């Protein structure tokens, strides 16, 4: 088989109460939204933290005890049972001081690291499929601890994950964390540089793959915050296509599927903005929310961001070329970022991303590829970020017009 986090996207649910809002707001309530997460084809949701934590006090913090606000232990057990019946894995966040500004209390670790050791051993027997920990740059001897905890996690089963998260975007600071245990997923702000861009992004990704020996890894804009925090509205489709087709596991926060924005909801945290299911989800200020900002409204419109997300995620899970990590990038025009995805004699995929505000001709040439480059004269358009095109019918790779901010996803058989 394939280990489970390779087969789909990860969905981060930081605040249980903002995610479902009124009525539910529980572990028992989260149970009712599983069929929805299935419609996003997420193979693992990143849950919590949900443990007891008195703001900035080590003694008054216990990772083995759930906070009554979120429910009970039987609610959690009940949640795991249903989730496994629906092929949905659950990753628990154990960031200790998640109510204070320093997530690891201070540079005095000793007592804090011991607590984390016991929690892993405890919650794996309760049946969780992995763990997350954030703000590692504030942890003394970070790489040493991530090595040990990774070994406990993999020891239980090889089909168990550890995710670590940093706010840093420096490449050398990121690699030094990875020099510890190379099978460890690391989310970061490495990609976060919108507005002024060009083909800066193309290099960033190939440089990272270059340095890491092309090992399996994660793709995100941050450890916890939304896409809208970093990107302008009219770049969300482009980045969504990219994250869903780059070699590795893509990681989103709840709300990225509908383009959820912390601003535009006056007086609300950038961490835990309320999820928008329909018109009644935001009562505080009535008219501020509209139908096209909601799940309900975007479920109707085929042109919506939610529609793009669901279709991209369906490909990412079903198709084998996007499930394994075989990837090659073109040397096209100065705005573009194009690449090929393939595995054995399965169906091949071609991506083309225009980052500028100007129309382009995609002159994607053989230019630096393997012997398995041999592109056809024609490939079928599966999907475009902009409505208008004839989806399903063949285009021509030499003569290829790209409108500002457009993204194309093209399919073709192994034998050209
Ligand atoms: Zn290849």
The residue to which tokens 């945290």 are assigned: 269
- Distance (angstroms) between ligand 1 centre and the Cα of 366 equals 13
- Distance (angstroms) between ligand 1 centre and the Cα of 352 equals 17
- Find out whether 411 and 349 touch, Cβ atoms under 8 Å: yes
Q: Crossing angle, helix 142-156 and helix 171-178, to 10 degrees?
A: 50
Q: Is 316 exposed, middle or buried (0-12, 13-18, 19+ CB in 10 A)?
A: buried
Distances (CA, A) of 11 to 39, 243, 249: 12, 13, 11
- Distance (angstroms) between ligand 1 centre and the Cα of 16 equals 41
Name the nearest CA neighbour of 241 among 371, 379, 410. 410
- Distance (angstroms) between ligand 1 centre and the Cα of 213 equals 14
**CA angle, residues 315, 251, 210, in degrees to nearest 5:** 90
State the Cα–Cα distance between residues 151 and 156, nearest whole angstrom.
9
- Distance (angstroms) between ligand 1 centre and the Cα of 204 equals 19
* Neighbouring residues of 88: CB distance < 8 A, sequence distance ≥ 6: 34, 37, 38, 42, 43, 44, 45
- Per DSSP, 373 falls in state G
- Find out whether 43 and 88 touch, Cβ atoms under 8 Å: yes
CA dihedral sign of residues 43, 274, 71, 185: positive
Distances (CA, A) of 252 to 125, 228, 258, 378: 27, 11, 11, 33
- Distance (angstroms) between ligand 1 centre and the Cα of 394 equals 23
- Distance (angstroms) between ligand 1 centre and the Cα of 345 equals 12
- Per CATH, which fold does 1-325 belong to? TIM Barrel (3.20.20)
- Distance (angstroms) between ligand 1 centre and the Cα of 342 equals 6
Query: Domain residue spans in the chain?
Result: 1-325, 326-416
Pairing verdict, β 378-384 and 394-396? antiparallel
The residue to which tokens 């399996």 are assigned: 216
CA dihedral sign of residues 53, 59, 64, 69: negative
- Distance (angstroms) between ligand 1 centre and the Cα of 185 equals 22
- Distance (angstroms) between ligand 1 centre and the Cα of 368 equals 12
- Distance (angstroms) between ligand 1 centre and the Cα of 14 equals 37
Q: Tell me the backbone φ, ψ of residue 218, rounded to 5 degrees.
A: -115, 155
Distances (CA, A) of 297 to 41, 66, 290, 301: 20, 35, 8, 7
- Distance (angstroms) between ligand 1 centre and the Cα of 215 equals 14
Name the nearest CA neighbour of 10 among 43, 33, 36, 40. 43
- Find out whether 12 and 252 touch, Cβ atoms under 8 Å: yes
Residue 128 corresponds to which tokens in the numbers above? Answer: 């969780």
How far, rounded to the nearest angstrom, does the alpha carbon of residue 294 sit from its chain's CA centroid? 20
- Distance (angstroms) between ligand 1 centre and the Cα of 363 equals 21
Q: Tell me the backbone φ, ψ of residue 301, rounded to 5 degrees.
A: -65, 115
Q: What is the maximum alpha-carbon separation in the chain?
A: 67
Q: Residues in the chain, how many?
A: 416
State the Cα–Cα distance between residues 110 and 330, nearest whole angstrom.
49
Residue 254 corresponds to which tokens in the numbers above? Answer: 């709840």
* Neighbouring residues of 260: CB distance < 8 A, sequence distance ≥ 6: 226, 228, 254, 273, 275, 276
Name the nearest CA neighbour of 400 among 340, 348, 355, 353. 353
DSSP element (H, E) containing 211: helix 200-211
Helix locations, 5-94, DSSP H: 16-20, 27-31, 34-38, 73-85
- Find out whether 347 and 413 touch, Cβ atoms under 8 Å: yes
- On the CB side of 381, CA atoms within 13 Å amount to 18
- Find out whether 142 and 136 touch, Cβ atoms under 8 Å: yes
- Find out whether 17 and 258 touch, Cβ atoms under 8 Å: no
**CATH architecture, range 326-416:** Sandwich (2.60)
- Distance (angstroms) between ligand 1 centre and the Cα of 327 equals 6
Classified as helix, coil or strand, 189 is coil
Resolution in A: 2.8
- Distance (angstroms) between ligand 1 centre and the Cα of 341 equals 7
State the Cα–Cα distance between residues 133 and 103, nearest whole angstrom.
9
How far, rounded to the nearest angstrom, does the alpha carbon of residue 239 sit from its chain's CA centroid? 11
- Distance (angstroms) between ligand 1 centre and the Cα of 139 equals 38
Instruction: Name residue 66's beta-bridge partners.
Output: 51
Classified as helix, coil or strand, 44 is strand
Classified as helix, coil or strand, 231 is coil
- Distance (angstroms) between ligand 1 centre and the Cα of 269 equals 43
Secondary structure (DSSP) of 116-177: HHHHHHHHHHTT--EEEE--GGGSTTHHHHHHHHHHHHHHH-SS-EEEEE-S---HHHHHHH
- Distance (angstroms) between ligand 1 centre and the Cα of 326 equals 5
Q: Tell me the backbone φ, ψ of residue 391, rounded to 5 degrees.
A: -80, 135
Residues followed by a break in the chain (C to N exceeding 2.5 Å) are none
- Distance (angstroms) between ligand 1 centre and the Cα of 325 equals 9
Helix locations, 273-321, DSSP H: 295-300, 305-318
DSSP element (H, E) containing 360: strand 360-361
State the Cα–Cα distance between residues 336 and 198, nearest whole angstrom.
8
Omega prior to 230 cis, within 30 of 0: no
- Find out whether 163 and 218 touch, Cβ atoms under 8 Å: yes
Classified as helix, coil or strand, 100 is coil
Method: X-ray
DSSP element (H, E) containing 244: helix 236-245
State the Cα–Cα distance between residues 166 and 70, nearest whole angstrom.
26
């Amino acid at each position: 088989a394939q280990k489970w986090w390779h087969t789909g996207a990860l969905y981060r649910i930081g605040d249980l109460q903002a995610f479902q809002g009124h009525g539910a707001g529980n572990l028992a309530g989260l149970k009712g939204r599983l069929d929805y997460l299935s419609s996003l084809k997420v193979k693992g949701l990143v849950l919590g933290p949900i443990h007891k934590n008195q703001k900035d006090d080590v003694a008054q913090t216990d990772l083995l005890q759930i906070d009554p606000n979120f429910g009970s232990k039987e609610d959690f057990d009940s949640l795991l049972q249903s989730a496994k019946k629906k092929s949905i894995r659950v990753i628990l966040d154990l960031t200790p001081n998640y109510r204070g500004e320093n997530s690891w209390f201070s540079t005095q670790v000793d007592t804090v690291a011991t607590k984390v050791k016991d929690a892993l051993e405890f919650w794996l027997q309760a049946g969780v499929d992995g763990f997350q920990v954030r703000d590692i740059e504030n942890l003394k001897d970070a790489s040493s601890f991530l090595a040990e905890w990774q070994n406990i996690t993999k020891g239980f089963s090889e089909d168990r994950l550890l995710i670590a998260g940093t706010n840093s975007s420096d490449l050398q600071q990121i690699l030094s964390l990875l020099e510890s245990n190379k099978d460890l997923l690391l989310t970061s702000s490495y990609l976060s540089d919108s507005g002024s861009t060009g083909e800066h992004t193309k290099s960033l990704v190939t440089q990272y793959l270059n340095a890491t020996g092309n090992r399996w890894c994660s793709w995100s804009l941050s450890q916890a915050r939304l896409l809208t925090s970093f990107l302008p509205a009219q770049l969300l489709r482009l980045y969504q296509l990219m994250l869903f087709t780059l070699p590795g596991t893509p990681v989103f926060s709840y709300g990225d599927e509908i383009g959820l924005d912390a601003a535009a909801l006056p007086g609300q945290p950038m961490e835990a903005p309320v999820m928008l299911w329909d018109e009644s989800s935001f009562p505080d200020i009535p008219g501020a929310v509209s139908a096209n900002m909601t799940v309900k409204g975007q479920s109707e419109d085929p042109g919506s961001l939610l529609s793009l997300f669901r279709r991209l995620s369906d490909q990412r899970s079903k198709e084998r070329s996007l499930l394994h990590g075989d990837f090659h990038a073109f040397s096209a025009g100065p705005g573009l970022f194009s690449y090929i995805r393939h595995w054995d004699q399965n169906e091949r995929f071609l991506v083309v991303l225009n980052f500028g505000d100007v129309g382009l001709s995609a002159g994607l040439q053989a230019s630096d590829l393997p012997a398995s480059a041999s592109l056809p004269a024609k490939a079928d358009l599966l999907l475009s970020t902009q409505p208008g095109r004839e989806e399903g019918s063949p285009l021509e790779l030499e003569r290829l017009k790209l409108e500002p901010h457009e993204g194309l996803l093209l399919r073709f058989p192994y034998a050209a």
